[PDB]
Ligand binder design. Sequence first.
Ligand SMILES: O=c1ccn([C@H]2C[C@H](O)[C@@H](COP(=O)(O)OP(=O)(O)O)O2)c(=O)[nH]1
Ligand SMILES: O=c1ccn([C@H]2C[C@H](O)[C@@H](COP(=O)(O)OP(=O)(O)O)O2)c(=O)[nH]1
Ligand SMILES: O=c1ccn([C@H]2C[C@H](O)[C@@H](COP(=O)(O)OP(=O)(O)O)O2)c(=O)[nH]1
Ligand SMILES: [Mg+2]
Lengths: 127, 127, 127
Amino acid sequence: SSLLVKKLVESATTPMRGSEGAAGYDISSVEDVVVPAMGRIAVSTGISIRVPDGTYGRIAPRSGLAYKYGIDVLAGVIDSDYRGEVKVILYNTTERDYIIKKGDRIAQLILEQIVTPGVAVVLDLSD
Amino acid sequence: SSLLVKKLVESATTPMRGSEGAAGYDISSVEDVVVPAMGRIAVSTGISIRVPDGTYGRIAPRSGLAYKYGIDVLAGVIDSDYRGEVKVILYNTTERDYIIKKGDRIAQLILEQIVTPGVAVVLDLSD
Amino acid sequence: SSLLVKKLVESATTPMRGSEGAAGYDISSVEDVVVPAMGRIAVSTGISIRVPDGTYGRIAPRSGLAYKYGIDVLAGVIDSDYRGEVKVILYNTTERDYIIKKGDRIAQLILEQIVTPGVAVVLDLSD
Ligand SMILES: O=c1ccn([C@H]2C[C@H](O)[C@@H](COP(=O)(O)OP(=O)(O)O)O2)c(=O)[nH]1
Ligand SMILES: O=c1ccn([C@H]2C[C@H](O)[C@@H](COP(=O)(O)OP(=O)(O)O)O2)c(=O)[nH]1
Ligand SMILES: O=c1ccn([C@H]2C[C@H](O)[C@@H](COP(=O)(O)OP(=O)(O)O)O2)c(=O)[nH]1
Ligand SMILES: [Mg+2]
């Protein structure tokens, strides 16, 4: 029901929500790195999570970094049984490099509800 | 419960759904612009929204523009408490430019259900 | 309620989930192709689906292909009334080409819950 969070390093930051009606929790870097121009990387968050059953955690793009620096968020699907560290793959769509300092909010964890019903095979999906 | 929509300009178009089983509402441009090759922009929708509590609005990619012109949708997370204008950041993955005329469907607003439970810290997520 | 699946070719593979807490079903290619460097394509899955009402199927990025080969997933929104073949548009963010063999897991189908309430127009979203 609640969102579980295991801290893996000193700096690690307990995911929180920027506001009441906020769609997601703030995922932040625990490392100083550089998302190279037209390049990509996996940033360290220093944390591992367990999204509530009946949902999966989506690593979603932060508006600011997107509009101003053209930072895209690759991958992003964290399954509810996954126990490893959350990595945030970042793609720099720009010709310019982009710098990340420990503590910067690099993304947001949205807890999206899904369904995992069984799969039946048919010959006709209509009607 | 319903999807609220405040119109900000003349041209603004009340978000609607292309069909009964449609996943989202049609977000359209209220400006004539050009998403430059290997470039990006924030298109004006002329509208502000309030997605139903218990969800957030996702600006999602339209299939056609994606397959034919390689148009990607950056950012995209609209929180339920946000009151400003909805901007649709578009990334042109192609070497060719791409033109948008007022009224063109530039994306789709999907209302996705999420959860915002409190966050507990543990030492072990398993078991 | 269940996830319907119509097989369109010999090779077609009945979508399954890699694990109990898995967020999505494994979508795989039924064709040998190459996502060109800084290029994109629509891969054939040999299948058509009908996601449960009250949800839409999201073609989501697979972590491995993202981190190691910089493969992004364009479009991705499959509506619940859609009856055609599921195509997986893939964008190669790298300078290197990328090869897909029949049977390779090219993505994952996440069944996300949404809402499609009516749309009301207001002058003020706040309060
Ligand atoms: O593609 C997008 C993504 C977000 N927003 C809106 C929704 C959200 O409520 C607000 C967020 O701005 P911000 O998050 O406060 O700035 P930042 O992302 O740098 O924290 O911008 C858009 O209009 N278009
Ligand atoms: O990556 C994708 C995205 C969408 N579709 C399917 C789902 C949807 O039901 C249909 C939509 O085609 P369209 O929306 O009618 O064309 P357009 O996007 O130009 O409106 O295509 C795919 O097969 N692959
Ligand atoms: O941006 C992402 C996407 C996924 N994961 C985690 C969540 C998931 O549980 C695990 C999946 O690794 P994998 O799927 O087993 O490898 P592959 O994608 O090649 O199947 O990686 C991340 O840390 N960051
Ligand atoms: Mg993307």
